[PDB]
Structure formats: structure tokens, C-alpha cells
Coordinates of C-alpha atoms in Angstrom, one line a residue:
Chain A
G1 CA 15.9 -18.7 -60.0
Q2 CA 17.1 -18.7 -56.7
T3 CA 38.3 -35.3 -37.0
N4 CA 41.1 -35.5 -35.0
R5 CA 43.5 -37.9 -36.7
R6 CA 44.6 -35.5 -39.6
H7 CA 44.3 -32.6 -36.6
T8 CA 47.0 -35.2 -35.1
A9 CA 49.4 -35.8 -37.3
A10 CA 50.7 -32.3 -38.4
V11 CA 50.7 -31.3 -34.5
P12 CA 53.2 -29.8 -31.9
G13 CA 54.0 -27.6 -34.3
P14 CA 56.5 -29.6 -35.8
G15 CA 58.4 -29.1 -33.1
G16 CA 56.9 -31.9 -29.8
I17 CA 58.3 -29.0 -27.4
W18 CA 56.4 -25.9 -27.6
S19 CA 52.4 -24.6 -28.1
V20 CA 50.9 -24.0 -31.4
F21 CA 51.3 -21.1 -33.8
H22 CA 48.2 -19.6 -33.7
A23 CA 45.5 -18.9 -30.7
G24 CA 42.5 -20.4 -31.9
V25 CA 39.6 -20.0 -34.6
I26 CA 36.9 -17.9 -34.6
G27 CA 34.2 -19.8 -36.1
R28 CA 34.9 -22.5 -39.2
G29 CA 36.5 -21.1 -42.1
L30 CA 36.3 -22.0 -45.5
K31 CA 32.4 -22.5 -45.8
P32 CA 32.4 -26.1 -47.5
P33 CA 29.3 -25.2 -49.4
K34 CA 29.8 -21.8 -51.4
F35 CA 27.4 -22.7 -54.3
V36 CA 26.2 -20.5 -57.3
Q37 CA 23.0 -21.1 -59.2
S38 CA 23.8 -22.5 -62.7
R39 CA 20.7 -24.7 -63.4
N40 CA 19.9 -23.8 -66.8
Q41 CA 19.0 -21.1 -68.8
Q42 CA 16.7 -22.8 -71.3
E43 CA 13.4 -24.4 -70.4
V44 CA 13.1 -21.9 -67.6
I45 CA 11.1 -19.1 -69.3
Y46 CA 9.3 -21.9 -70.2
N47 CA 7.8 -22.5 -67.0
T48 CA 7.2 -18.9 -66.2
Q49 CA 5.1 -19.2 -69.6
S50 CA 3.0 -21.8 -68.3
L51 CA 2.7 -20.2 -65.2
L52 CA 1.5 -17.5 -67.2
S53 CA -0.8 -19.0 -69.1
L54 CA -2.1 -20.8 -66.5
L55 CA -2.8 -17.7 -64.1
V56 CA -4.7 -16.2 -67.3
Chain B
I1 CA 17.1 13.5 -3.4
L2 CA 15.8 12.6 -7.1
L3 CA 14.7 8.7 -6.8
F4 CA 13.8 8.0 -10.5
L5 CA 11.4 4.9 -11.2
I6 CA 11.9 3.3 -14.5
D7 CA 10.0 0.3 -14.8
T8 CA 11.7 -2.0 -17.3
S9 CA 9.0 -4.2 -17.8
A10 CA 8.0 -6.5 -20.8
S11 CA 6.5 -4.5 -22.6
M12 CA 9.2 -1.7 -22.7
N13 CA 10.3 -3.7 -25.4
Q14 CA 8.1 -2.0 -28.4
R15 CA 11.0 -0.1 -31.5
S16 CA 10.5 3.2 -31.5
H17 CA 10.8 4.6 -35.1
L18 CA 14.1 6.6 -34.1
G19 CA 15.7 2.6 -34.3
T20 CA 15.5 2.3 -29.9
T21 CA 13.0 0.4 -27.2
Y22 CA 11.5 2.8 -24.8
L23 CA 13.8 1.3 -22.3
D24 CA 17.0 3.1 -24.0
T25 CA 14.6 6.6 -24.7
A26 CA 14.1 6.5 -20.7
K27 CA 17.4 6.5 -20.2
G28 CA 18.9 8.6 -22.4
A29 CA 16.1 10.5 -21.5
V30 CA 17.4 10.3 -17.7
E31 CA 21.3 10.8 -18.7
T32 CA 20.6 14.0 -20.4
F33 CA 18.3 15.6 -17.4
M34 CA 21.4 14.5 -15.3
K35 CA 23.8 16.8 -17.5
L36 CA 20.8 19.2 -17.4
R37 CA 20.6 19.5 -13.9
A38 CA 24.5 19.3 -13.7
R39 CA 24.2 22.8 -14.7
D40 CA 22.9 24.5 -12.1
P41 CA 25.1 25.2 -9.6
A42 CA 23.5 22.6 -6.8
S43 CA 23.9 19.4 -7.7
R44 CA 26.6 18.5 -5.1
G45 CA 24.3 17.7 -2.1
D46 CA 21.4 15.9 -3.7
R47 CA 21.2 12.0 -3.9
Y48 CA 20.0 9.6 -7.1
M49 CA 17.5 6.9 -6.2
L50 CA 16.7 4.2 -8.6
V51 CA 13.2 1.5 -8.3
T52 CA 12.5 -1.0 -11.5
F53 CA 9.7 -3.2 -11.7
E54 CA 10.7 -6.0 -9.5
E55 CA 10.3 -8.5 -6.6
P56 CA 10.8 -6.7 -3.3
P57 CA 14.3 -8.0 -2.5
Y58 CA 14.6 -6.9 -6.4
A59 CA 13.4 -3.6 -6.8
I60 CA 15.1 -1.5 -5.4
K61 CA 18.8 -1.1 -7.3
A62 CA 20.7 1.9 -5.4
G63 CA 19.8 3.4 -2.5
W64 CA 21.1 5.0 0.9
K65 CA 24.6 4.7 1.3
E66 CA 25.3 5.0 -2.6
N67 CA 27.3 7.2 -4.7
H68 CA 26.7 7.9 -8.3
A69 CA 28.8 5.5 -10.0
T70 CA 26.9 2.2 -8.1
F71 CA 23.7 4.5 -9.7
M72 CA 24.8 4.7 -13.3
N73 CA 26.2 0.8 -13.2
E74 CA 22.8 -0.3 -12.1
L75 CA 20.3 2.0 -14.6
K76 CA 22.8 0.9 -17.4
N77 CA 22.7 -2.8 -17.2
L78 CA 18.3 -2.3 -16.8
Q79 CA 16.6 -5.1 -18.8
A80 CA 13.2 -4.8 -19.4
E81 CA 11.6 -8.2 -18.9
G82 CA 8.3 -8.3 -16.2
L83 CA 4.8 -7.2 -15.6
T84 CA 3.7 -3.8 -14.7
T85 CA 4.0 -3.6 -11.1
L86 CA 3.2 0.1 -10.7
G87 CA 1.3 -0.3 -7.3
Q88 CA 3.8 -2.6 -6.1
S89 CA 7.1 -0.5 -7.5
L90 CA 5.3 3.4 -6.0
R91 CA 4.2 1.8 -2.4
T92 CA 8.6 0.4 -2.4
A93 CA 9.4 3.6 -3.3
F94 CA 7.3 5.5 -0.9
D95 CA 8.9 2.9 2.0
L96 CA 12.2 3.6 0.9
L97 CA 11.5 7.4 1.0
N98 CA 10.3 6.9 4.6
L99 CA 13.3 5.3 5.9
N100 CA 14.4 7.6 8.1
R101 CA 11.9 10.2 8.8
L102 CA 11.3 8.6 12.1
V103 CA 14.5 8.2 13.3
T104 CA 15.9 11.8 12.7
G105 CA 12.3 14.2 14.0
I106 CA 10.6 14.3 11.1
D107 CA 6.9 14.3 11.4
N108 CA 7.5 13.5 15.1
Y109 CA 3.3 14.1 15.3
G110 CA 3.7 15.6 18.7
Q111 CA 5.1 18.7 18.5
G112 CA 3.1 20.3 15.9
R113 CA 3.7 20.2 12.2
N114 CA 7.6 21.9 11.9
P115 CA 7.8 22.6 7.8
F116 CA 11.2 23.9 8.0
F117 CA 12.2 20.1 8.3
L118 CA 12.6 19.1 4.7
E119 CA 13.4 16.0 2.5
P120 CA 12.9 16.9 -1.0
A121 CA 12.1 13.9 -3.2
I122 CA 10.8 13.7 -6.5
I123 CA 9.5 11.1 -8.3
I124 CA 10.1 10.3 -12.7
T125 CA 7.4 6.6 -12.8
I126 CA 8.4 6.6 -16.1
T127 CA 6.3 3.9 -17.6
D128 CA 4.7 2.3 -20.4
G129 CA 0.7 3.8 -22.2
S130 CA -1.7 1.7 -20.0
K131 CA -3.0 -1.8 -19.6
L132 CA -1.2 -2.5 -16.6
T133 CA -1.2 -6.0 -15.2
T134 CA -1.2 -8.1 -12.0
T135 CA -0.5 -11.4 -12.9
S136 CA -4.3 -12.1 -13.7
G137 CA -5.9 -9.3 -15.5
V138 CA -5.9 -5.6 -17.4
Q139 CA -6.9 -3.4 -14.3
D140 CA -7.9 0.1 -14.6
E141 CA -8.0 1.8 -11.4
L142 CA -4.5 1.3 -9.8
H143 CA -5.2 1.0 -6.7
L144 CA -2.4 0.7 -3.7
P145 CA -1.9 -2.3 -2.2
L146 CA -1.5 -2.8 1.5
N147 CA -0.7 -5.8 2.6
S148 CA 2.7 -5.1 5.2
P149 CA 1.8 -1.5 6.4
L150 CA 5.7 -0.1 8.4
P151 CA 5.8 0.3 12.0
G152 CA 4.4 4.0 12.6
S153 CA 2.6 4.1 9.3
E154 CA -0.9 4.5 10.6
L155 CA -0.4 8.0 11.9
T156 CA -0.4 9.4 8.5
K157 CA -2.7 7.2 6.0
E158 CA -1.6 8.1 3.2
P159 CA 1.9 6.2 1.4
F160 CA 3.5 9.9 0.1
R161 CA 4.4 12.7 2.8
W162 CA 4.6 16.7 3.3
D163 CA 7.2 16.5 0.7
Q164 CA 7.6 14.3 -2.2
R165 CA 5.8 14.9 -5.2
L166 CA 5.2 12.8 -8.7
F167 CA 5.6 13.3 -11.9
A168 CA 4.7 10.9 -15.1
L169 CA 6.5 10.1 -18.3
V170 CA 4.6 8.0 -20.2
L171 CA 6.7 8.3 -24.0
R172 CA 3.8 8.0 -26.2
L173 CA 5.9 8.2 -29.2
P174 CA 4.8 6.8 -32.5
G175 CA 6.3 4.1 -34.0
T176 CA 6.5 5.4 -38.1
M177 CA 7.4 8.7 -38.0
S178 CA 5.8 11.1 -35.0
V179 CA 4.9 14.1 -37.2
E180 CA 2.5 15.4 -34.4
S181 CA 5.1 18.7 -34.6
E182 CA 1.4 21.2 -34.7
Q183 CA 2.0 22.7 -31.3
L184 CA 5.4 24.0 -30.7
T185 CA 5.2 25.5 -26.8
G186 CA 2.7 23.0 -25.8
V187 CA 3.1 20.4 -23.0
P188 CA -0.4 18.5 -22.5
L189 CA -1.0 15.6 -20.4
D190 CA -1.1 11.7 -20.7
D191 CA -4.2 11.2 -19.1
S192 CA -3.8 7.7 -17.3
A193 CA -4.3 6.4 -14.6
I194 CA -1.3 7.7 -12.9
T195 CA -2.3 11.2 -13.7
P196 CA -5.0 11.4 -10.3
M197 CA -1.9 9.5 -9.0
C198 CA 0.0 12.2 -9.5
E199 CA -1.7 15.0 -9.3
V200 CA -2.7 14.7 -5.5
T201 CA 0.8 14.5 -4.8
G202 CA 1.0 17.6 -6.5
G203 CA 3.1 17.3 -9.5
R204 CA 2.1 17.4 -13.3
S205 CA 2.0 14.1 -15.5
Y206 CA 3.9 14.7 -18.9
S207 CA 2.7 13.3 -22.3
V208 CA 6.0 12.1 -24.2
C209 CA 5.3 12.2 -28.0
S210 CA 8.0 13.2 -30.2
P211 CA 12.1 14.0 -29.3
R212 CA 11.3 17.6 -29.4
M213 CA 9.2 17.6 -26.9
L214 CA 10.8 14.8 -24.4
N215 CA 14.1 17.8 -25.2
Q216 CA 10.9 19.9 -23.8
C217 CA 9.4 18.8 -21.1
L218 CA 13.0 17.1 -19.6
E219 CA 13.7 21.2 -20.5
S220 CA 10.5 22.5 -18.2
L221 CA 11.1 20.1 -15.5
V222 CA 14.4 20.4 -14.4
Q223 CA 12.8 24.3 -13.3
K224 CA 10.6 22.4 -10.8
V225 CA 13.1 21.0 -8.3
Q226 CA 13.3 23.4 -4.6
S227 CA 12.5 23.1 -0.8
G228 CA 8.7 21.0 -0.9
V229 CA 6.1 22.5 1.3
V230 CA 3.0 21.9 -0.3
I231 CA -0.3 22.9 1.1
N232 CA -4.0 22.9 -0.1
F233 CA -6.2 25.9 -0.2
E234 CA -10.0 25.6 -0.2
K235 CA -12.7 28.8 -0.9
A236 CA -15.1 27.9 1.8
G237 CA -16.1 29.3 3.6
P238 CA -16.6 33.1 1.9
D239 CA -18.6 33.2 -1.2
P240 CA -16.0 34.7 -3.4
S241 CA -15.9 37.7 -0.8
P242 CA -13.2 39.6 -3.4
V243 CA -15.5 42.4 -4.3
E244 CA -12.6 44.9 -4.1
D245 CA -12.2 45.8 -7.9
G246 CA -14.8 43.5 -10.0
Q247 CA -17.2 40.7 -9.3
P248 CA -16.5 36.8 -8.8
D249 CA -18.0 34.2 -10.5
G250 CA -13.2 30.0 -10.6
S251 CA -11.4 27.0 -10.7
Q252 CA -8.3 28.9 -8.2
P253 CA -10.5 27.3 -5.3
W254 CA -8.5 24.1 -4.7
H255 CA -5.1 25.4 -5.3
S256 CA -2.5 22.1 -4.2
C257 CA 0.9 24.0 -5.2
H258 CA 4.1 23.9 -3.4
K259 CA 6.5 26.7 -1.6
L260 CA 9.8 27.5 -2.1
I261 CA 11.2 27.6 1.7
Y262 CA 14.7 28.6 0.8
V263 CA 17.4 28.9 3.6
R264 CA 19.4 31.7 5.1
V265 CA 18.9 23.3 6.8
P266 CA 15.7 25.5 6.7
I267 CA 15.0 28.5 9.6
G268 CA 11.8 29.0 10.9
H269 CA 9.1 29.2 13.5
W270 CA 5.2 28.9 14.1
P271 CA 4.3 26.4 12.4
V272 CA 1.0 24.3 12.0
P273 CA 0.5 22.3 14.8
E274 CA -2.1 20.1 13.8
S275 CA -6.0 19.5 12.7
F276 CA -7.7 18.1 16.1
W277 CA -8.4 18.9 19.7
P278 CA -5.3 17.8 21.9
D279 CA -6.5 15.6 24.6
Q280 CA -4.2 14.7 28.2
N281 CA -5.5 11.6 27.9
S282 CA -5.6 10.2 24.2
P283 CA -3.9 6.3 23.8
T284 CA -4.1 6.5 20.1
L285 CA -3.5 9.5 18.4
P286 CA -5.8 10.3 14.9
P287 CA -3.8 9.8 12.0
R288 CA -2.8 13.5 9.7
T289 CA -3.1 14.4 6.8
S290 CA -0.1 15.1 4.0
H291 CA -1.7 18.1 3.0
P292 CA -3.0 19.9 5.6
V293 CA -6.7 21.6 4.9
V294 CA -6.3 25.4 5.0
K295 CA -8.4 27.9 4.5
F296 CA -8.5 31.6 3.7
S297 CA -10.9 34.2 4.3
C298 CA -10.9 37.0 2.5
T299 CA -11.2 40.2 5.0
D300 CA -8.6 42.6 5.1
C301 CA -8.9 42.8 9.0
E302 CA -5.8 44.9 10.0
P303 CA -2.8 44.0 7.1
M304 CA -0.3 45.9 9.0
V305 CA 0.9 44.1 10.7
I306 CA 4.4 45.3 12.2
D307 CA 6.4 43.7 15.7
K308 CA 9.6 42.0 16.2
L309 CA 8.3 39.0 15.8
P310 CA 10.5 37.1 13.6
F311 CA 10.2 36.9 10.5
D312 CA 9.5 34.4 7.9
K313 CA 10.2 34.5 4.0
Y314 CA 8.4 30.6 2.6
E315 CA 8.0 31.6 -0.7
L316 CA 5.0 30.8 -2.3
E317 CA 5.0 29.0 -6.4
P318 CA 2.8 30.7 -8.6
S319 CA 0.3 28.4 -9.9
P320 CA -3.0 29.9 -9.2
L321 CA -2.0 33.3 -8.7
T322 CA -4.5 34.7 -11.3
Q323 CA -7.4 35.5 -8.6
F324 CA -5.1 37.6 -6.8
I325 CA -3.9 39.5 -10.2
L326 CA -7.3 40.1 -10.9
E327 CA -8.0 41.8 -8.0
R328 CA -4.5 43.8 -8.4
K329 CA -2.4 41.7 -6.2
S330 CA -4.5 43.6 -3.4
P331 CA -2.1 46.3 -2.7
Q332 CA -2.0 46.7 1.1
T333 CA -4.1 44.6 1.8
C334 CA -4.3 40.7 2.4
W335 CA -6.6 38.0 3.4
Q336 CA -6.9 36.3 6.5
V337 CA -6.1 32.2 6.7
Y338 CA -7.4 29.1 8.7
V339 CA -7.0 25.1 9.1
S340 CA -9.9 23.6 9.8
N341 CA -11.0 20.5 11.2
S342 CA -11.5 21.3 15.0
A343 CA -8.8 23.4 15.4
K344 CA -9.9 24.5 19.0
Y345 CA -11.4 22.9 21.8
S346 CA -15.1 24.0 20.3
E347 CA -14.9 26.4 17.1
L348 CA -14.4 25.7 13.5
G349 CA -11.4 27.1 12.3
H350 CA -8.7 30.0 13.4
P351 CA -7.2 32.7 12.0
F352 CA -3.2 32.3 12.5
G353 CA -2.1 34.2 8.9
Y354 CA -2.3 35.8 6.4
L355 CA -1.7 36.1 2.7
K356 CA 0.1 39.0 2.1
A357 CA 2.0 40.5 -1.2
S358 CA 5.0 41.9 -1.7
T359 CA 5.5 45.5 -2.6
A360 CA 7.1 44.0 -5.7
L361 CA 3.6 42.3 -6.8
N362 CA 5.5 39.4 -7.7
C363 CA 4.4 36.4 -5.8
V364 CA 2.6 35.4 -2.5
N365 CA 5.4 35.6 0.8
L366 CA 2.9 33.1 2.8
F367 CA 2.9 35.2 5.8
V368 CA 2.8 32.3 8.7
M369 CA 1.4 33.9 12.1
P370 CA 1.3 32.4 15.6
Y371 CA -1.9 31.1 16.5
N372 CA -4.1 33.8 17.0
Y373 CA -1.9 36.7 16.4
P374 CA -4.2 39.5 17.2
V375 CA -4.6 39.1 20.6
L376 CA -1.5 39.0 22.1
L377 CA 0.0 41.4 19.5
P378 CA -1.6 44.4 21.2
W379 CA 0.2 41.9 32.7
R380 CA -3.0 42.9 34.5
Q381 CA -3.7 38.8 34.7
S382 CA -4.3 39.1 31.1
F383 CA -1.4 36.7 29.8
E384 CA -2.9 33.8 32.0
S385 CA -6.1 33.8 30.6
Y386 CA -5.1 33.9 27.2
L387 CA -2.6 30.8 27.1
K388 CA -5.9 28.4 27.5
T389 CA -7.3 29.0 24.5
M390 CA -4.2 27.4 22.4
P391 CA -2.9 23.8 22.1
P392 CA -1.2 23.1 24.6
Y393 CA 2.0 22.0 23.2
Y394 CA 2.5 25.0 21.0
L395 CA 3.9 26.7 24.2
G396 CA 6.8 24.9 23.1
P397 CA 8.0 26.7 19.7
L398 CA 6.7 30.3 20.6
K399 CA 8.6 30.4 24.2
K400 CA 12.0 30.4 22.5
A401 CA 10.5 33.8 20.9
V402 CA 9.5 34.9 24.3
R403 CA 13.8 34.1 24.9
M404 CA 14.4 37.2 22.9
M405 CA 12.7 39.6 25.7
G406 CA 12.6 37.5 29.2
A407 CA 11.4 34.3 30.8
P408 CA 7.8 34.1 32.8
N409 CA 7.0 30.6 31.8
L410 CA 8.4 27.1 32.6
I411 CA 8.1 23.7 32.5
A412 CA 5.0 22.9 35.0
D413 CA 2.7 22.9 32.3
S414 CA 4.9 21.7 29.1
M415 CA 3.6 18.5 28.7
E416 CA 1.3 17.0 25.6
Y417 CA -0.3 13.7 26.7
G418 CA 1.1 11.1 29.5
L419 CA 0.1 8.4 26.7
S420 CA 1.5 10.1 24.0
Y421 CA 4.7 9.9 24.9
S422 CA 5.1 6.1 25.2
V423 CA 5.0 3.3 22.3
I424 CA 7.0 5.9 20.3
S425 CA 10.1 4.9 21.0
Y426 CA 10.2 1.3 20.2
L427 CA 8.2 2.5 17.2
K428 CA 11.4 5.1 16.5
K429 CA 13.6 1.3 16.8
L430 CA 11.6 -0.9 15.5
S431 CA 11.4 2.1 12.2
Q432 CA 15.3 2.0 12.6
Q433 CA 15.6 -2.0 12.8
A434 CA 13.3 -1.8 9.2
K435 CA 15.3 0.5 7.5
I436 CA 18.9 -1.3 8.4
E437 CA 17.9 -4.2 7.0
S438 CA 16.7 -2.9 4.4
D439 CA 19.4 -0.7 3.2
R440 CA 21.8 -3.8 3.9
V441 CA 20.3 -6.2 1.4
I442 CA 20.1 -3.6 -1.6
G443 CA 22.3 -4.3 -3.8
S444 CA 23.3 -7.9 -2.8
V445 CA 20.6 -9.8 -5.2
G446 CA 22.0 -13.4 -4.7
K447 CA 19.6 -14.9 -7.4
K448 CA 20.8 -18.2 -7.5
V449 CA 17.4 -19.5 -10.1
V450 CA 19.1 -21.9 -12.6
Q451 CA 16.7 -25.1 -13.5
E452 CA 14.1 -26.3 -16.1
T453 CA 12.2 -28.0 -13.4
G454 CA 12.0 -31.6 -15.5
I455 CA 8.0 -32.7 -14.7
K456 CA 6.8 -35.8 -14.9
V457 CA 4.0 -36.2 -16.5
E458 CA 16.1 -39.1 -9.4
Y459 CA 12.5 -38.9 -9.6
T460 CA 10.7 -35.8 -8.7
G461 CA 14.2 -34.2 -7.8
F462 CA 16.0 -33.7 -11.3
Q463 CA 16.0 -30.3 -12.7
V464 CA 18.1 -29.3 -15.8
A465 CA 20.8 -26.4 -16.3
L466 CA 20.0 -23.3 -17.8
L467 CA 22.3 -21.1 -19.9
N468 CA 24.6 -19.1 -17.4
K469 CA 26.1 -15.9 -19.0
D470 CA 28.6 -15.1 -16.4
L471 CA 30.2 -18.8 -16.1
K472 CA 33.9 -17.7 -17.1
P473 CA 34.8 -21.0 -17.9
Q474 CA 38.5 -22.2 -16.9
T475 CA 40.1 -24.2 -19.3
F476 CA 43.4 -24.6 -17.8
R477 CA 42.3 -25.3 -15.2
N478 CA 39.3 -28.0 -15.4
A479 CA 39.4 -30.8 -17.9
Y480 CA 35.6 -30.2 -18.7
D481 CA 35.3 -26.6 -20.0
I482 CA 37.8 -27.9 -22.9
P483 CA 35.7 -28.7 -25.5
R484 CA 36.0 -32.2 -28.3
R485 CA 37.0 -29.4 -31.3
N486 CA 40.4 -27.5 -30.2
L487 CA 41.1 -30.0 -27.6
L488 CA 44.6 -31.6 -29.2
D489 CA 46.3 -27.9 -29.6
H490 CA 44.6 -27.0 -26.2
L491 CA 46.2 -29.9 -25.0
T492 CA 49.7 -29.0 -26.4
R493 CA 48.9 -25.5 -25.5
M494 CA 48.4 -26.8 -21.8
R495 CA 51.4 -28.9 -21.9
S496 CA 53.5 -25.8 -23.3
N497 CA 51.8 -23.2 -20.3
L498 CA 53.0 -25.8 -17.3
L499 CA 56.3 -27.1 -19.1
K500 CA 57.5 -23.6 -19.3
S501 CA 57.7 -22.3 -15.2
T502 CA 57.5 -19.6 -15.6
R503 CA 56.6 -16.2 -13.6
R504 CA 52.8 -15.7 -12.3
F505 CA 51.0 -18.4 -14.0
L506 CA 47.8 -17.9 -14.2
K507 CA 44.7 -20.5 -15.7
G508 CA 43.1 -18.7 -18.4
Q509 CA 43.6 -19.1 -21.7
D510 CA 43.2 -15.8 -23.1
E511 CA 41.9 -12.8 -20.1
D512 CA 42.9 -9.5 -22.0
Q513 CA 40.6 -7.4 -20.5
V514 CA 37.4 -5.9 -18.5
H515 CA 34.8 -3.7 -20.5
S516 CA 37.0 -0.6 -19.3
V517 CA 40.5 0.3 -19.9
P518 CA 41.5 3.4 -18.0
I519 CA 44.3 5.2 -18.9
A520 CA 45.2 6.2 -15.2
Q521 CA 44.6 3.2 -13.2
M522 CA 47.0 1.6 -15.2
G523 CA 49.6 4.1 -15.0
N524 CA 49.4 4.3 -11.4
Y525 CA 50.7 0.6 -10.7
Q526 CA 53.9 2.1 -12.8
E527 CA 57.3 4.0 -11.7
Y528 CA 59.0 7.1 -13.7
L529 CA 61.8 7.9 -12.9
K530 CA 61.6 11.6 -15.0
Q531 CA 60.4 14.8 -13.0
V532 CA 60.4 16.8 -16.7
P533 CA 62.7 19.6 -14.5
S534 CA 62.8 21.4 -18.4

């Protein structure tokens, strides 16, 4: 086992006369992938069994 | 004066067992050496200089007219990148140390060799272990290059000077554990290419192997800084005639130790004039030697010398005193000393002093006597015939002592050579101009080197730019420095900043502060109407 249209439709700090509330971003934030290894439990130990049999 | 030579070469990037590279350990050792030397109440007159393995215009980081602040700032930002050019760096350091020597009067080469005009300097030359490179291969000889000699340097024939010691640190720290801690009080030698170069000057070369050994060598190095009077001794020619209390058989012959000439500038007279016979007409002067080849002879020869002669206390550093201690330090007896290499017109050496020890039998006092004392001390037309055996220029200093009694001499025969005076002021002016040009371009780097040199393999003239570290992009002033991601928000920010009409506007988006934030510096630019009288 193991871009700007949306930023424009909600801009101007809802006032159209001042700057933004925040002061910028640090990196990217809210990492998209966030994937966890959940392939399978069964039929995984049998591959290890076949590999050990080949090695034997 | 201390000139630290830290190579900062690419070979100084390997990590020790502690987790830091050799360059970080060298900088920490320099800082602890500073804080150790600050303990002695004598660090108020010394000056620190820095020399790295870089180009001649970039090798020097802090030299003359540079305080401790810029020195620490330059040593802080040292980067280890480059080859190990030890010879060129040593030559540059020696030329930097010999910039203000031909202008003040030190080593005038015409009026003896005054030992009380000292300019102490200690080099540390902290480098790597071995395998030095010169852009072609790996050499194993360490020969100093001679490409552009300084004006007035052919009269010494050696780069180092009368008082210029050279200690070395190799920093041979293991990478795994550095568990070699058998010998507690023992500092061996490095046994490298820098060892002979250090031993020639008069300083040893330590071999750092553990942080404890590093602390030991640093605590042993702080006790080796004083006035630099280095003279060389030889056993010739007496065949070890020390038959006083035992029989001789030795290694304490070529002693090249230093001498502590502590002041009471230094006060003294009767210097070692030279080693040759100076003629009245000599256009070319023979080159002197940094270490005088003076030899001693073991003879009693009335060691009791009491007179109104001005007294000198040039203390000798004990390095080869075992040969003297074997003979009970020669109580109430001494042995003459004489300089070789044609000290007179026709003779081999003239006794001009002795090495009588003190009553406490602690060290050697190095009693320096006139050129020929056993004759003038004990006029019937005698002094006029006696003053012909001494060198001509030597009548300069001795006459000052005669000023204590009278003044029988004059300026009639006070002439060294008609050709020695010429071609001397021009050399001094050239040396002063070179020193000024070196001290001028000492900190202004002005590299301006950022290009990729796109090869063919707008033509033949293109070069891609490189990443600039200290770019400081102007986000409010320049529109090209605004990336695409934070463009609309930055646009609104610039709009609000321009339409605010505030006071003291700036073009920086967020400039917090610099690396240092002092409290007194910020509190000085303020006003507090209070005094706390209660």
C-alpha cells in the first residue's frame, strides 16, 4: 500500500470604494487532492503471497 | 592587528557530525576567539581584517579604515563557493599587510633594521584538509605566485615580513561521531602543505579534530599574541662547545622563535644593521631577509658588562630553552652572538651581543649590545681609528647615546650612499598610491553579473537574465511586478491607496522592517515630556 471571473464577481470588499479585507494569501491553501489510500483490504495479501512464492 | 583568512571555498560545504558545515564551525570559532580575546584588557587597539578565497578585487572584505561593525557584517554573510586558491589569497593578504610599511618608515632598508618599529599581525588561514585546486588540477607543492610584484618589494625577496606570524586550522572534524578523545592535553600538527609555510614564518599549524580540541587550540592560541621580534639562531660554528656541566651531543639549533619587545611605541636602540658590506657607491641594494641569520658562540668572554649604556629588555619567548636549562641556565655567565653573511669588510661575523639570562632564571633577556662593545667600553687618537670598523650608517643611532655625554661628532661623514637615497621617494609614492587604490575599492563590489550567455550551437548578443536575490519589486509603482494570481485584489488595493490621499505615501505593499530592530534607535526618534523626578 501507499480563474479571475470568480475573483471578480465577489470583489471590491462588497463596498466598491475600499480595498480588500485581507492582505493576500501565503501559499495556495485548501489542498485539492487530500487523497487517502483506500484501494482494498482483500486480494492484496494474495499478491504478497504470490511474490513470496516466486521468491521462494 | 589580526587578519583572519577564511577560505569560504566550495570544499567547505561538507557537514560535520554536529550538523553544521565547516564554514559555520569556522565562523563560530572566530566569534569565540573574539569573545576570549576580549577578556584580556589589551583588545582596545587591535584591528580585525578579513580575507577570503575570491578574486583580487573581491578577496578583501574588511581592511584598513574599517570598524568592527562592517567586519562582523562581512564575516556574517560569508558564502562557501569557489576553488581553493591558497597561494593567491596568502599573497593578497601579505600585500594588504604591507601597504603602510614603506610610508611610515618601517623597514627603511637604509638605516639599520630597527626592532622597536613593530606592526604585529597574526594570520589564521582557516582552510580545508587537503586537495587544493588551481582551476586545472590538484597541486601538492603550494608555491606562491609571482605575477605583479609591488613597487619596492625586491629588497626583501620574501612575501612575509619581520613580524608576521602564520597559524593554521584545518578543521578535520569527522562526520559520524568524532570519538577520538584519547589524548586530553595534546595538540598534534596537521602535516599538510601549509605546515612548512607556517613553520617558516614562526607559527605552528593546529589540527582540529573535535570541538573540545577546537576549544583547546583556541584557548592556546590567545596566549601567542605579543610584539613580533622573530630572529633565527644557528649552532655554527662552535661544535656544541657547551662543556660547562656535562657533555653535549641536538635539535635546539635552528630556533626561529619570537621575542616579546614590551614597551615602557617601543623604546630601544642599537638595532641589527644588516647582513652585507655596504659600499659608498651602490645603485642596486642587496635584498634583505625577513629572518636575520644570526649565530651564537659559547664563550664566557667577560659576561659582566656594566656601564651607562641605555638598557634594553627585549624578552625572548621560551621555545628552545632546554639547551640552556641543561647547563643550569648558565649562572653568572653568557655566550656571545654574531650576525653572519659578511657583517664587515673582510671577516666572517662580528660579536655584537650575548644571551645572558636573568637572576630569576625564567627566560632569556636578549641583551642587545653595540656593533663592537668590548673595545669602545674600556682619547689619544683612538676613537678616530676605531670608528672605521663599524658600518657608516651605524654612526646614526649610537651618536644619540653620545648626546647623553657630549657631541664630538658631526654631519661630515654621516652619509650612507649617494645612490641609495635616489629611487627611494618615487618607490614610496608608488607604494602610497597603491595602498590608497587598494583601500578605496575594498568594500564596493559592484558585481553586476547576471546573464545566461545563450549560445547558438539579436544574434550573438542575447543573454537570458538570472534570478535576482535583492530585487525589491515595486508593486505600487511598477505594474510589471504584479503577477496574475493576485491582480484584481492588488488592483483594488492600489486604487484605495491612491484615492485615500493620506500623508507620506509609499510604493511598497508591505515593508515591515529590516533584519535588525533596535529599541534605542526607534526610541531616539520620539519625544517624551517626562523626567521621573520622583
